[PDB]
Amino acid sequence: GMARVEYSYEKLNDTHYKLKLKVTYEYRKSPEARRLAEDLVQAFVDALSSLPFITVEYEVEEVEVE
Amino acid sequence: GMARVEYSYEKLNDTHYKLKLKVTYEYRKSPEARRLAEDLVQAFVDALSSLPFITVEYEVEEV
């Protein structure tokens, strides 16, 4: 399908960067692509949240088709 | 299909960091899932690598 990731981030004094990711993707009505997209986005979520020197917030947006 | 993202990192400064990623996935015979997995990886990477406080090194493996 197709995917997009735009972000907002904020830097305050002595406070590690705060990051918000907006994840939008289309799975073209394919169940395997939907399962794989949710598993992969979640896998990226677990990797980025674990980073201790940055605060990560998420917004995921599924789209059936273009 | 299932997917997995291994990760590591190291300190460059107290603001700049180096993030390493290893993405593994399967597409379950679905062409749409395969391209979607790759577009998702490219989107995350381009977004993270555009952050001035992050440098990204990554590899992708199919299973």
Numbering used by the authors:
A (entry chain A): 3 to 68
B (entry chain B): 3 to 65
From the paper:
To evaluate design accuracy we attempted crystallization of 19 designs and succeeded in solving crystal structures for seven (three C2s, two C3s and two C4s). All crystal structures had the correct oligomerization state and closely matched the design models (median Cα RMSD of 0.6 Å across all designs, with resolutions ranging from 1.8 to 3.4 Å). The side chain conformations in the crystal structures also closely match those of the design models. HALC2_062 is a three-layer homo-dimer with a single helix from each protomer packed together between two outer β-sheets (one from each protomer), while HALC2_065 is also a mixed α/β homo-dimer, but has a single, continuous β-sheet shared between both chains, which wraps around two perpendicular paired helices. These two hallucinated structures are distinct from any structure in the PDB, with TM-scores to their best matches of 0.59 and 0.54 respectively.
